[PDB]
Design a binder for this molecule. Structure first.
Ligand SMILES: CC(=O)N[C@@H]1[C@@H](O)[C@H](O[C@@H]2O[C@H](CO)[C@H](O)[C@H](O[C@H]3O[C@H](CO)[C@H](O)[C@H](O)[C@H]3NC(C)=O)[C@H]2O[C@@H]2O[C@@H](C)[C@@H](O)[C@@H](O)[C@@H]2O)[C@@H](CO)O[C@H]1O
Length: 163
């Protein structure tokens, strides 16, 4: 079987640059969040298949917020990447990952957070937001693995095919 660095228990930490944090939730809802503390608060949420547009509640950046989610796939799970741009602002939707595998991943590099998006088995790191703060903390509600950038091909493989 595949051998990855992990699983690590859920925590809040200063994710080192140039590592994929491959997150492996078992529960729907909030999966992970991060912030540069200045103009980006980002969060991913997991939605099960066959969900008509609806408003659910999540605790993001400490606050209970109401966000519209949907997933019109009868079979694929959907991670949604939400971002707010100021401390007191509202979250907007920026990217999604539709997947049979229930894994998502992001990386801090080049002052950005890269994110796997698309539809498995063809998800790719096509999306990023800009944070310009290498010491940005990430909070994770799920177990996760760390994959160095040299093994990006393996991260892509796991996102798309599972472990
Ligand atoms: C459907 C589709 O193909 N859309 C493409 C856009 O996604 C592309 O826009 C850029 O996409 C990037 C991710 O792949 C990234 O999100 C980027 O914005 C981010 O990076 C810039 C600097 O490079 C800024 O710092 C932004 O603030 C940052 N976004 C966040 C939320 O932090 C996108 O670039 C922005 O959007 C594009 C369209 C231009 O208007 C830029 O001036 C913006 O900065 C892009 C293709 O690469 O166009 C679409 O086709």
């Amino acid at each position: 079987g595949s051998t990855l660095d992990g699983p690590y228990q859920p925590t809040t930490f200063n994710l080192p640059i140039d590592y994929w944090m491959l997150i492996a939730p078992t529960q729907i809802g909030r999966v992970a969040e991060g912030t540069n503390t200045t103009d980006r608060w980002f969060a991913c949420v997991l939605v099960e298949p066959n969900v008509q547009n609806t408003q659910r509640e999540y605790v993001l950046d400490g606050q209970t917020v109401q966000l519209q989610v949907s997933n019109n796939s009868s079979t694929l799970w959907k991670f949604i990447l939400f971002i707010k741009l100021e401390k007191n602002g509202a979250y907007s939707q920026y990217s999604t990952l539709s997947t049979s595998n229930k894994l998502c991943a992001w990386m801090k590099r080049e002052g950005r957070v890269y994110w796997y998006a698309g539809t498995t088995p063809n998800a790719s790191e096509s999306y990023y937001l800009t944070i310009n703060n290498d010491n940005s903390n990430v909070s994770c509600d799920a177990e996760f693995y760390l994959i160095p950038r040299s093994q990006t091909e393996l991260c892509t493989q796991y996102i798309n095919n599972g472990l």
